[PDB]
Design a protein. Sequence first.
Lengths: 280, 280, 280, 280, 280, 280, 5, 5, 5, 5, 5, 5
Amino acid sequence: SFVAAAVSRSGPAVVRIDQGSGFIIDNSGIILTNAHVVDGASVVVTLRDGRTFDGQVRGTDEVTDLAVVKIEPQGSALPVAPLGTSSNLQVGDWAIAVGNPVGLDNTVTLGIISTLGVEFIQTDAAINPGNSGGPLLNARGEVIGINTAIGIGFAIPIDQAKAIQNTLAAGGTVPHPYIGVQMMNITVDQAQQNNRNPNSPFIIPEVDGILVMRVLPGTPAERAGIRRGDVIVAVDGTPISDGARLQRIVEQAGLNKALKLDLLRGDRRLSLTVQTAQLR
Amino acid sequence: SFVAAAVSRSGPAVVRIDQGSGFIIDNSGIILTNAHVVDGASVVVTLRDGRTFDGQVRGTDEVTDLAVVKIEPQGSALPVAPLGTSSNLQVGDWAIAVGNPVGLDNTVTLGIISTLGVEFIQTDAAINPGNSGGPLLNARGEVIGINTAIGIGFAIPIDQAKAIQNTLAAGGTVPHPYIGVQMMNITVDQAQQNNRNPNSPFIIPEVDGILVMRVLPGTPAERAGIRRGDVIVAVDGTPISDGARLQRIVEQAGLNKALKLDLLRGDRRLSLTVQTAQLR
Amino acid sequence: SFVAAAVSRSGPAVVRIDQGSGFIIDNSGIILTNAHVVDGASVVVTLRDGRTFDGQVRGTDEVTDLAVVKIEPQGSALPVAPLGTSSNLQVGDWAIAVGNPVGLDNTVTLGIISTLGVEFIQTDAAINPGNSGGPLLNARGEVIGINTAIGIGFAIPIDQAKAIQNTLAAGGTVPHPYIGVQMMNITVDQAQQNNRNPNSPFIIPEVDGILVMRVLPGTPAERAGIRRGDVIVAVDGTPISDGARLQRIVEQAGLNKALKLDLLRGDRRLSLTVQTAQLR
Amino acid sequence: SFVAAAVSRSGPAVVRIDQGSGFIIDNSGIILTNAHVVDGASVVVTLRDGRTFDGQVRGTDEVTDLAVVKIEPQGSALPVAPLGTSSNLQVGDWAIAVGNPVGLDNTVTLGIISTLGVEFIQTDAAINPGNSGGPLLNARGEVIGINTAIGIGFAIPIDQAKAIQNTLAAGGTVPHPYIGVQMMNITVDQAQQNNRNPNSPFIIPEVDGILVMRVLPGTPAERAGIRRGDVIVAVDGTPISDGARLQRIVEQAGLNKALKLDLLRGDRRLSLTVQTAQLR
Amino acid sequence: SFVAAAVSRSGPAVVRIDQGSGFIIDNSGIILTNAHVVDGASVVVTLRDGRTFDGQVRGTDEVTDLAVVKIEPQGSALPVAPLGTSSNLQVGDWAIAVGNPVGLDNTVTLGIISTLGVEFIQTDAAINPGNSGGPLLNARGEVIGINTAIGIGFAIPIDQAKAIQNTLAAGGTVPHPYIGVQMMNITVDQAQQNNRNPNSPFIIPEVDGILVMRVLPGTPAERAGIRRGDVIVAVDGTPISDGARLQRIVEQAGLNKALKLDLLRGDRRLSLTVQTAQLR
Amino acid sequence: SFVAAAVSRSGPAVVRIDQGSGFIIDNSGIILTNAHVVDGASVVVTLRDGRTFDGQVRGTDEVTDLAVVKIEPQGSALPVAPLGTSSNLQVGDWAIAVGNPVGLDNTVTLGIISTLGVEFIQTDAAINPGNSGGPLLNARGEVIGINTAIGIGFAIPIDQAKAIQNTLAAGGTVPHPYIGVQMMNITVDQAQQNNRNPNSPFIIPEVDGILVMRVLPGTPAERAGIRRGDVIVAVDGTPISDGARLQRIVEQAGLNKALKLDLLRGDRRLSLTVQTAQLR
Amino acid sequence: XXXXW
Amino acid sequence: XXXXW
Amino acid sequence: XXXXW
Amino acid sequence: XXXXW
Amino acid sequence: XXXXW
Amino acid sequence: XXXXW
Ligand code: NA
Ligand code: NA
Ligand SMILES: [Zn+2]
Ligand SMILES: [Zn+2]
């Protein structure tokens, strides 16, 4: 079977972490896994061959859910999993999820790339606590993702983990700018439609947009005076009605980057500047 | 025991209905019970002595939850329960709940008047499906209420059932004027307090009052344009802030009685006239 | 309080058994309790004063749910509860339920006789595992029942326990004749009414009677060929339609007493003789 | 991967419906889906490319669970999924389930034909609300079924949907003749075996056959006098003992086609004619 | 009814607290209630007559579950509940539980003293969140307890609340010495009986005594080296085998009172001194 | 599809058993299945072609969960499934699970060998009650396992069933030596770590090893005096600390083979000889 | 009806 | 507040 | 047996 | 709409 | 036995 | 550790 080759290629580099899995990224002893495998730790690593090194967690991104562990190479060469690239993934490509749940073998499951979010990988390969943090391979045996348990599983794209590799190897805080608002895409035909239901919470000022559904406690949005039911219309002068889209321009703005917000509170015209803080 | 006397006095007039209980109000065969005992029916009555008459339901008030059944007197005199009065009930008076769950005896439970709503009687006498529709007696054995199952039970005050006795004996529709709004007593210190929570549904225009919490479907309130979040301030020119109090002036107004309503919708000044319909 | 007297009279004779309660019937050390307190045992008894005798169970009736324990009198006189009579119980009489849950006091609860089955006593006195097997007293403090936990409690009438006292003191098997059939009272207007429902199990041969609802495994009824759906009409020549009534004539017949049964199986005419066995 | 080709072939024709999926059958704008996706509607369609047409449901078969939607072709050519044939399906063939859950991509899952009912397709391809109404493809990318969510999924065979395509395109009522009886295959060795259990509902007249287990309300079977427990032996003179088989001859008979039924009710010989109505 | 008098005597002094009840102890505005009514607060008090004072919590004992609130007397005299004494309570005495759940009436329930722990009062008077913190009266209407919700309710004896009244009026910390060990009374015939079960946790060194079942985190017992399974035999030279009894001598010792403990850990002879800390 | 070949090769030999599946091992009528399919039986077999033979269970191993059924060859040749070998299984090989849930077709599911215990096979092929007892095939269609239902399924390796084939064909009792102890691998750094938790059941005598966690009722271990909390150190003189390893040497010893055990009970030095009995 | 037995 | 209606 | 209908 | 944050 | 503490 | 037996 073609999967046997793939597994023979990256499988020896898939380790147990202590629960969860991980894979060795290079001969130095740089190991990738899920942040939720590293209950904050500061761990223990078992290779497929039985060797037990003592790893320490040199970085963690809770929001991307991936961590970097470090072990010290001694004796035999640390086996290494080849990194592929997730940019050229095609829906329908073979996907192989490898774990090391006990620390002496690989549990291997097979499926395809079910959907592509670049953003997130779904696959119908059985993804479970036994292979979480472990790698997801293509048919050639190069890792294109990191399994993440929560019939369709998820995996963090590999190119995503490449980006924050050094940062988590060194000082582990990745820039995740945010303002703290739960928004929802509103349509006029949902708005004035809402406005005709006598028991709707608030009347939406017609229009299309991002209806602020909730202001989260202790967030820049709260501190800027933003209220539930507000309708943000123009950031600085860019018309928006997509929640996905606003989740971006905040990121393209730095941390501690003051952003003005044009919004209307029922009838009133409101402009406030929020300062992007770090998601934590 | 003093309760044995009481039970010997009204107990023979307590019947089974078919589930639930009832009591015979006079020798004509006028029987009181709960509306929820008469699943709409149109029934069968068993006396304590085993006699089975065939009753028909000549009236029902679903909202007061009491019904009038009629049976045809034949042979021996229908035993009759003496009616007392609930106006002079004192908290702490003995209360005896009598039922006829099988149709050949009385189940009897004993307690006190726990609280007085005139409006509703609570008692720590065991009130259960076996004695529901049955009478609640004072220490002398005169009925002061009608048990209503749903450790404290409820009973409909007897003077209340006296009022609508003839109406339910004849044509069974009792005037229950209403407008269809679920209101809540709001305080300034709850209002501007609400207004400082960023995630509250709507901003209350400060003040004290009746915050319209919900407009029920197909009600006069809906038809008058009343919306959730509206704050009714003055009916015609009578300042109100009590939900209990407004539940009254509507009643003192007839059925189909147009009532103007001064309310403010956030900032706007709103006057609407609702026409009281029949609760059903 | 009048109950304080009653409790002072029989309370010292109420013991803990080991869970459950019991009471001492005479100075010999004859103790009454529930059969379900004596998980078959063969026990330990604690008096209100702290004295711990060692009791043995000299009898058990599982179907009446009462047992006789025996302890050996030594030192101080065993306190003794006066036995009243349940024959003259009036609905509404005061009832006091006494237990000894720890073995150093009495838990006492108060209520009335809620209903009278002679057959079974119901009361609104709190009856719970703490006072089960314990006595139920009248206002004078003589026992009129034995509490039985399973808001209304049950108690075994005392005159009932008097009857089988010696038998359970000596060789513990009480004559409980039976045949093993679950019957139901059927009415023509339930029968031909059943017969017009196309999805009813079997057509009942019209008539009124005892519809055999279930034949229990390994019973005389099974061995006599009795089937579910049979309709017993005349025992030997006595028309019956009451399940309660048939539960009697079997008892008035001895154990191993052959009883013929006239029944019809749909259309066919069936006469079978069942031999009454002992309920166990 | 071979599935990438298949998906590239039919995937662009897989649309979102509004929840559920569908696929475009030709350039006219004829769309297939599940009847349970069309909560009766009368909808909105989103293509993979983001184009949102406005569809209307021109037909529905609730019992086959498939619907035909129609959209109006404008601008770019509506992509079209090639229809294969389900007649030549082999157990073990590759099966690809495609959905369009958001309206901008395909979620794709892979498996095999697990079993073949022609009648119904099972597959171990992940079938879920995200791909329901969507197509099931063979390895070449031609649709051989319609996914139906409810680890094994179901799909409506494509040749089945071809048959009722025009009918649901035009006036949407497909002939589903029926009589309304829940039958069960009975065996002598189950029959006289049943007859020896004393607590079985009814005695089966020995034989092998279709034991009428239930007569459903308001059905031809009810109107013909058919009762639970009846045993249908010969339709007009064709011996039957298979529930699957009788589910056929009724279909080969028209709607409103009178069918005589030879059955025995315990001992009696019964012949009744039921008139086949439309399942609804 | 005699209860009407009692209620007329203490009922006007029963207030609502804001959920829970309380009663006014003197004209100064000293109010008793449950500590669990005062979710730590620092409150609002409504009298039966509708007067709303503003109370503050000047003391709390979480372990006795009672609190002292203070309000400022103005206008009409604060009604006052007469304090009785719980020392002379007899099992079977009438008990009346009064609450003020809304702030304009009394809910009153009636029962008896079910059992006496001085330590704790049980009663079959309905005790619920509506009357918790409220008083429990004798037949004359003097308070003998404080209702405490969690069919039998509990009440804190009044003489108990008298003792810590001033302390909670002033600086609110009551001496509750403890060591932090969960003990269990062990018997030789339970010990060597335990020792013959092959799957019992630890072998008990025979004997009778207090088997340390659990050492609670951060307690004097933990700090003294006490382990689960230890058997304390002699405090300083007083043989003990009762858990209730040891719960005393610690109290008769002060706070920060070093107590030596003779115990054996399996075979070894162990003497440790624990220093009594404050339960919190 | 390659699986179609495989299924065409072994699929006709896959039968229904009566619930569960099985496969025919040779033309004699030797059938393999799960022991849990044969609820003890002593059965009925349906071939894919509809032929119903009458099988009897000539052997059962409850602990390996496989059974041998026998049917009598008549008429057409019994189709036969080719046996492969599980010794050379590679993780990632294709695995095809075949069942015959109704008795007229094959339900077929596809996946890979997920992990290899020789000891147990896991696969991501859908394994369910419909294919349990059925065979698991490689890509060529030779059976390498027996499906066992309980997303990853299990299968009994085929070479394992080959070993006990004759034994279960003849007299059905397979040697399963055991002693009856639930052990756990203990580490010093878990031991003295356990010993520093004040609430741990027993103090472990430091060391590494097999901590006896439980002695099961009526086992050789119980009869040898082994207690919970004992630490077995050397069998006869072989240091052990692995639960998996001890589960072996007992097997390499016969049935009724006396094995000495060096263990320490806290401080004491204990040597006991257990006699291996048969697991049942 | 009752039954029992 | 109450409501009802 | 099946049924349906 | 999404939200998050 | 009781415990508490 | 495992156990079993
Ligand atoms: Na009472
Ligand atoms: Na696959
Ligand atoms: Zn799969
Ligand atoms: Zn009560």
